[PDB]
């Protein structure tokens, strides 16, 4: 049994590939392979074109007061 090899390097080397978020764009807008097994044709083709939010709806919901409390169930 031998001790492992302790390989020492400069701390700056481990940050060579790191880029600050304010210096890089969002690559998730080109992520096609990440959608497989998670996103369906229904969501992309039928649902989202109909049920996308609009700025008007978002503003109306944000400005409107809280909805009334949901009524308690009644056996009727």
């Amino acid at each position: 049994i031998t001790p492992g090899i302790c390989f020492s390097t400069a701390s700056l080397v481990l940050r060579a590939t790191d880029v600050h978020p304010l210096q890089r764009i969002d690559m998730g807008r080109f992520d096609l392979i990440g959608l497989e097994g998670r996103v369906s044709r229904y969501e992309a083709d039928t649902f989202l074109p109909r049920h996308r939010l609009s700025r008007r709806v978002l503003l109306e919901v944000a400005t409107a007061p809280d909805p009334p409390p949901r009524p308690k169930p009644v056996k009727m």
Binding site: I1, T2, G4, I5
Partner: protein
């Protein structure tokens, strides 16, 4: 023990002054070559020079490989001796230069002192301690001890199904847990338990043993390039997903050099430079020869013995470049050439007699003379190979010794290369291609 082609070669048969006795240690001739090999053996034993190359040159059957194995026998089993054939560099996993470099490091051995820490006893308490550690109680015939061990050791104990009453062996260095059996004291409780019982250990619970380990530089390189000592999931993953050899870098070899130098300085390691032997060197190509230039120029390299029976032959990997031994002239400038000669009929008879004695065969003088005559034509190898079939024929006929009739009958049954060549030439139109 089976009798191989070189089983009679026990040494170089040299006297105290270095001169070669005529017949000694299973060697009959090649006195000049044996004396040169004695000098090479002294060079290897000096452990001072690095990368010194020797070429054994001569026709086939002149005992080049016998002389290399005799050098091995003179050195002893402690000194590494790596035999490789030139055809073995053509691997489908790593480059030819990598194969050569790995064989170079295999020739350098290292005797290193190591201390093994052992926990051995019957388990009396196995209490997890919340990742969960283990508190274990071990008893022997001399005492009892309680130990706190790492969670990895607890996982190993669980995998071994160790329960209270089992005799276990723990190696603290490698964390290797072995369950040996249920203690013998419980062997009477049942009639069919499906258990293997083991007596109680009779020493102490904790032992320290110092042993000498024989390793090579290649072993260290492999251990640090394909690690399996962490016992973690990543090591298993790397072993299963990457089982092939890899081209170990010069950086790893430099680190191993530093580690071994540190060990030698600490006084716990001894270096044995050792020998590499390449038998069919002409099978290497020009890339291998060019690499061997720089490899032999290294101050870490071992002593390399090369062999060749080729004449003025085209170097493999070149189109039409022809060199004296199949070896480019640049590498021949870096080698000491030991020349082997053809054997006289008397030496052939001596070798035949030695091989007969080695194979446990009694041969009459008339049969020995006839077989030496058979070896004068054809080859010595062919004459030696007729000993066992002739013995089998004599045994079938009820004779305990080989007579001339058995040798004649066997030679009639089996042809040599020249006779087969004559048959092929006479009937070229009937054989394929």
């Amino acid at each position: 023990q089976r009798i191989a082609s070189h089983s009679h070669v026990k040494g170089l048969g040299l006297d105290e002054s270095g001169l070669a006795k005529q017949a000694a240690s299973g060697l009959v001739g090649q006195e000049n070559a044996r004396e040169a090999c004695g000098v090479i053996v002294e060079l290897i034993k000096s452990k001072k020079m690095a990368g010194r190359a020797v070429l054994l040159a001569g026709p086939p059957g002149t005992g080049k490989t016998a002389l290399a194995l005799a050098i091995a026998q003179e050195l002893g089993s402690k000194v590494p001796f790596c035999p490789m054939v030139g055809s073995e560099v053509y691997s489908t996993e790593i480059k030819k230069t990598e194969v050569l470099m790995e064989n170079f490091r295999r020739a350098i051995g290292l005797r290193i002192k190591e201390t093994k820490e052992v926990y051995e006893g019957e388990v009396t308490e196995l209490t997890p301690c919340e990742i969960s550690h283990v508190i274990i109680g071990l008893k022997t015939a001399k005492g009892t001890k309680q130990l706190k061990l790492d969670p990895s050791i607890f996982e190993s104990l669980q995998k071994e199904r160790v329960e209270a009453g089992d005799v276990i062996y723990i190696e603290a260095n490698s964390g290797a847990v072995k369950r040996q059996g249920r203690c013998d004291t419980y062997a009477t409780e049942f009639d069919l338990e499906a258990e293997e019982y083991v007596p109680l250990p009779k020493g102490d619970v904790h032992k320290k043993k110092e042993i000498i380990q024989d390793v090579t530089l290649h072993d260290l390189d492999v251990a640090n390039a394909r690690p399996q000592g962490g016992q973690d999931i990543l090591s298993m993953m790397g072993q299963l997903m990457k089982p092939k050899k890899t081209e170990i870098t010069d950086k790893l070899r430099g680190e191993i050099n530093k580690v071994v130098n540190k060990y030698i300085d600490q006084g716990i390691a001894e270096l044995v430079p050792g020998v590499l032997f390449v038998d069919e060197v002409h099978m290497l190509d020009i890339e291998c020869f060019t690499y061997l230039h720089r490899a032999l120029e290294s101050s870490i390299a071992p002593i390399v013995i090369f062999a060749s029976n080729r004449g003025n032959c085209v170097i493999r990997g070149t189109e039409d470049i022809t060199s004296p031994h199949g070896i480019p002239l640049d590498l021949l400038d870096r080698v000491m050439i030991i020349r082997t000669m053809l054997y006289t009929p008397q030496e052939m008879k001596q070798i035949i007699k030695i091989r007969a004695q080695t194979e446990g065969i009694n041969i009459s003088e008339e049969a020995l003379n006839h077989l030496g005559e058979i070896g004068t034509k054809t080859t010595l190898r062919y004459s030696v190979q007729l000993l066992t079939p002739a013995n089998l024929l004599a045994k079938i006929n009820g004779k305990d010794s080989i007579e001339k009739e058995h040798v004649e009958e066997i030679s009639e049954l089996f042809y040599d290369a020249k006779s087969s060549a004559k048959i092929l030439a006479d009937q070229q139109d009937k054989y394929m291609k």
